[PDB]
Design a protein around this ligand. Structure first.
Ligand SMILES: NC(=O)C1=CN([C@@H]2O[C@H](COP(=O)(O)OP(=O)(O)OC[C@H]3O[C@@H](n4cnc5c(N)ncnc54)[C@H](OP(=O)(O)O)[C@@H]3O)[C@@H](O)[C@H]2O)C=CC1
Ligand SMILES: NC(=O)C1=CN([C@@H]2O[C@H](COP(=O)(O)OP(=O)(O)OC[C@H]3O[C@@H](n4cnc5c(N)ncnc54)[C@H](OP(=O)(O)O)[C@@H]3O)[C@@H](O)[C@H]2O)C=CC1
Ligand SMILES: C#CCN(Cc1ccc2[nH]c(N)nc(=O)c2c1)c1ccc(C(=O)N[C@@H](CCC(=O)O)C(=O)O)cc1
Ligand SMILES: C#CCN(Cc1ccc2[nH]c(N)nc(=O)c2c1)c1ccc(C(=O)N[C@@H](CCC(=O)O)C(=O)O)cc1
Ligand SMILES: Nc1ncc(N2CCN(c3ccc(Cl)c(Cl)c3)CC2)c(N)n1
Ligand SMILES: Nc1ncc(N2CCN(c3ccc(Cl)c(Cl)c3)CC2)c(N)n1
Ligand SMILES: O=c1ccn([C@H]2C[C@H](O)[C@@H](COP(=O)(O)O)O2)c(=O)[nH]1
Ligand SMILES: O=c1ccn([C@H]2C[C@H](O)[C@@H](COP(=O)(O)O)O2)c(=O)[nH]1
Lengths: 510, 508
């Protein structure tokens, strides 16, 4: 009974020029070491590797310490390796076998009572052989989110859908996303499938009491499970209600999520998120721009259905031009309380610049607890095309110059809006962190009326069948040029290692 | 090995005039039945009771079905009981014994292989006898939070600190607060003390202060607050602060409290209720004169409206006691031009409270039922920027009202228990005025922290196990039709039995 351990690009790439495709991934090596070395005493674990894999390792690390080293080869001889370096006391002698079945028989014959767990460590020859023999029970895969140039590949296998879009190997473990040297990765484990509290228990018994996302995944480290469990939760336990749009709603009240920003970026992978949109909208907010046609001209039509002549009239605003959101979001952000006229007016210097206040406070007095920005203006609500959903955000600096952000959202379209909102404010945190010389730490999402529309239910149930991929990294390009929040452009950002599942069509409740 | 099963007032009272002191508590009766009946087949449980207990039960329910009934009496005889009512099919014949030891001997002698668990069910003679013999391994106590006239009391026992203020019996289970017929109560259980291949990956990913760690089932909703305290001290970050006093803080924390059964006025330290009620009415008035609270014995705003603090805020034109355009003001007059605490602002600004209520009364599915105190245009005019800055309301299928409150800065030691009670009361008030049922209060916290000069007192607080939550009743319901109709005397707190007050200085 054998276990395989691999690091892999989304296209199954494992190596190039008898070396690793990526820069050093320290956490991955910690992982490789820990899994292969650990045992309950008398016994040790075995690592079976191909000849080139052996030769790819640098001298000082070979043989792998505290593990029996077996090299599958026909050219290399046991004495070749012995002559390579003197065998350290207490360590096992490096054995060589002609094939994998040979290496397994050697383990059975001379190493019973001596070895615990057998690990196939590479390369493509041994991985393919172990899969052909079907002797592999578990796969320890490190999913390198980025694609690199590779000449050697891990073989295709049933269940390789965990890497990229297309007896089975099903994920039973998915971790949160890590990152080393600008490379995002996570860890999955696949499986071959084909009177103490006893007396307390009866009171427990009478007090005690359907849809789950990828139920087989037992360890749910990936931070996207928050969102997937949130959808299930609302469908399971939510209340069917009437709604402004006329479309049905299953709603919940006061839900919550939080996402790390220090390793990777929470751009949801279980469906493709329109990143061009979030970026272009966020920048639009930051200008204090209130013309939806500027977004519409860039291919970002997210506000068009809510700025039509028809919708502006149902809002009792016949004096609004097509594309005028009124003084919402960006306007209150940069010009709180200023008297609105139209989208074409210059409001420079009017009202309160909340964003500039927050940023200056972050830069001088980061322990202040009044670092808040609100879009909710009860005086101007009837002038907006739609009252803001994400209406407030608060900032917080800790011991280690690490920035976190809370955003309150009164109304959350789980299916369509939520993934977008997570990305939009997580980006804002990165931007503010850079400008104030801070490290981004965490985005915290506080949700009011949290709902899925009835016409989304079927699509979301399909989405729950997909296991999340590692999160991407978002890099700020041109860091030296950008010094203020108004310096960011649409070309100052790089999404690296984004490998989502396919787009899912969901109609915007108008 | 015996288990006791009881319902009890905070003063140990259990009976009056050979009957129960309180109105009918249906959930307790369900509890009693379930605990005493349940078995894994071949066996049944035994209920040992005194003669007066047996006589207190109504005819139809006695003997207790599917349980061997043992009555302790020198007067009553086995044939008296037999003649009383015809023995039904499959039910044990009621047995009479001269003492508790005798009844336990009868269980050993004639009922080995037959009975599973033995339950002492009352009353005053048996409980005391069982505790004296030291044969009780577990106590099933239903803590009735209200006091009632009683002539029969459960005996004083080591660890009766779970009932009220002053081998051992330690709680190992505390449930959420229930209520029936205007009586709050909960359930405690005391105790005599005196896929492996996944794991290697888990271990490498991995790397002190806990409240009442011995209590293993943590159903009581106050555990949220208590665990929040522990969580900040363990995992919080020590920080500088506006007040110069040290702070250990976390960011973005949540709690939620049910309002359908009881009221989350914390029990692990006494909460200044008079204060919460007086301030909340003061908010609803749109009143910005802290001297109106101060005159009523509510001095919570005094330190922040002194001549000195007003000047440190660069407001030398502010008369002592003037919070500027604070919460009350923004609620009823959002965006109105402020003069001083003596001016009438009727008809000025937006009345957010009136809008929220009317929307709840006419269109409860609307998702814009919000009230905000945060006005960035007027922050520099206020004595203190609002901490609780935003609240949102929600109505469900069953006309049940829930309320979220976002707070930017949380003094966990001092402010938080006050704020939980404050907005929970607002929800009750708003529910009443809009013909609705209060369901839930949800607490969203920004900067969550405990001041360094509170940590010692908070550790003392964590050694206290919570008591059942009290009930808040709105008196004079008929008279009250609008949110402005509530007075100080329209409220009644029922069965509030907290631990002693803990002194904690306000970081000025
Ligand atoms: N990131 C990851 O997960 C890993 C990546 N890698 C990368 O991949 C590369 C190594 O992979 P690869 O090129 O496939 O090298 P291999 O380790 O598969 O080397 C092939 C050699 O091993 C022996 N061998 C291989 N297959 C068989 C077989 N079916 N039967 C008998 N003997 C066999 C032979 O030795 P002989 O010549 O004596 O016949 C053969 O020449 C390196 O570039 C390395 O960086 C490697 C391991 C893990
Ligand atoms: N809140 C609760 O959970 C409960 C409350 N109650 C309340 O308590 C009231 C009665 O309780 P209480 O007054 O204690 O009556 P008990 O149930 O203790 O019965 C007393 C009688 O039982 C016999 N007895 C009990 N203990 C002994 C002993 N150690 N040695 C000898 N004989 C014994 C005697 O019978 P005799 O004199 O005939 O020889 C005695 O008169 C009930 O009316 C009810 O209202 C009762 C049960 C549970
Ligand atoms: C939230 C927000 C900003 N907004 C503004 C906006 C305005 C009114 C709304 N109204 C309703 N009912 N739901 C919304 O999500 C919504 C969103 C958006 C509007 C549309 C799309 C949209 O059509 N979907 C994208 C997919 C992006 C995604 O995966 O989320 C697309 O491909 O067109 C996205 C964001
Ligand atoms: C929050 C809030 C409202 N407020 C207003 C208020 C104003 C400034 C503040 N400043 C600081 N630093 N912490 C606070 O908790 C605080 C609270 C209060 C102020 C004081 C007390 C107080 O002295 N303690 C009460 C005990 C009540 C309780 O158990 O919470 C007392 O007995 O005097 C309570 C509430
Ligand atoms: N997740 C995961 N990372 C690396 C490996 N290995 C691939 C190559 N390899 C290795 C060891 C040490 C060094 Cl220094 C070098 Cl350059 C290569 C042996 C271990 C694996 N099997 N799984
Ligand atoms: N937790 C806890 N609740 C109730 C009881 N009682 C059960 C026995 N008892 C009783 C039972 C049923 C009826 Cl109908 C009557 Cl009138 C009295 C008196 C109170 C207890 N022993 N423990
Ligand atoms: O940033 C946003 C803005 C809007 N919405 C969705 C949620 C609600 O379904 C709808 C808001 O319209 P009202 O129902 O609040 O009128 O749009 C979002 O999810 N995110
Ligand atoms: O309703 C309130 C108001 C204030 N505070 C606490 C939180 C902060 O510790 C302090 C206010 O200080 P600043 O927010 O002004 O820094 O008082 C509360 O707990 N509740």
């Amino acid at each position: 009974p054998v276990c395989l351990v691999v690091a892999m690009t989304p296209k199954r790439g494992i190596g190039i020029n008898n070396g690793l495709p990526w820069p050093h991934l320290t956490t991955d090596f910690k992982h490789f070491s820990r899994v292969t070395k650990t045992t309950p005493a008398s016994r040790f674990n075995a690592v079976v590797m191909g000849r080139k894999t052996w030769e790819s390792m640098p001298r000082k690390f070979r043989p792998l310490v505290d593990r029996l080293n077996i090299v599958v080869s026909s050219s290399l001889k046991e004495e070749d390796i012995a002559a390579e370096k003197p065998q350290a006391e207490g360590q096992q002698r490096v054995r060589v076998c002609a094939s994998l079945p040979a290496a397994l028989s050697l383990l059975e014959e001379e190493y019973k009572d001596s070895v615990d767990q057998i690990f196939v460590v590479g390369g493509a020859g041994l991985y393919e052989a172990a899969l052909s023999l079907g002797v592999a029970s578990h796969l320890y895969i490190t999913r390198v989110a980025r694609e690199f140039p590779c000449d050697v590949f891990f073989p295709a296998f049933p269940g390789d859908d965990i890497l990229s879009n297309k007896a089975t190997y099903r994920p039973i473990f998915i971790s949160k996303t890590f990152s080393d040297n600008g490379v995002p990765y996570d860890f999955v484990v696949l499986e071959k499938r084909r009177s103490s509290a006893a007396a307390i228990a009866p009171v427990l018994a009478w007090m005690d009491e359907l849809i789950r996302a990828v139920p087989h995944v037992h360890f749910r480290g990936h931070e996207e499970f928050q969102y997937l469990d949130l959808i299930a939760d609302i469908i399971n336990n939510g209340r069917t209600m009437d709604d402004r749009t006329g479309v049905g709603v299953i709603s919940k009240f006061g839900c919550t999520m939080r996402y790390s920003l220090d390793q990777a970026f929470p751009l949801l992978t279980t469906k493709r998120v329109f990143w061009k949109g979030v970026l272009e909208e966020l920048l639009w907010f930051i200008r204090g721009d209130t013309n939806a046609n500027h977004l519409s001209e860039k291919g970002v039509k997210i506000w068009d259905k809510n700025v039509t002549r028809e919708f502006l009239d149902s809002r009792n605003l016949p004096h609004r031009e097509v594309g005028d959101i009124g003084p919402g979001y960006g306007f209150q952000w940069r010009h709180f309380g200023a008297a609105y006229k139209d989208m074409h007016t210059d409001y420079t210097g009017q009202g309160v610049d909340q964003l500039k206040n927050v940023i200056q406070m972050l830069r001088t007095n980061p322990t202040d607890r009044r670092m808040l920005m609100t879009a909710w203006n009860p005086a101007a609500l009837d002038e907006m095309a739609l009252p803001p959903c994400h209406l407030l955000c608060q900032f917080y600096v800790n011991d280690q110059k690490e920035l976190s952000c809370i955003m309150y959202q009164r109304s959350c379209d789980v299916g369509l809006g939520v993934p977008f909102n997570i990305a939009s404010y997580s980006l804002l945190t990165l931007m503010v962190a850079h400008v104030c010389n801070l490290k981004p730490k965490e985005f915290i999402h506080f949700m009011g009326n949290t709902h899925v529309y009835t016409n989304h239910v079927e699509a979301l149930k399909e989405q729950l069948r997909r296991e999340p991929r590692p999160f991407p990294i978002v890099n700020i390009l041109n860091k030296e040029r950008i010094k203020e929040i108004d310096d960011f452009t649409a070309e100052d950002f790089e999404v690296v290692g984004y490998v989502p599942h396919g787009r899912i069509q969901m109609e915007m409740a108008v």
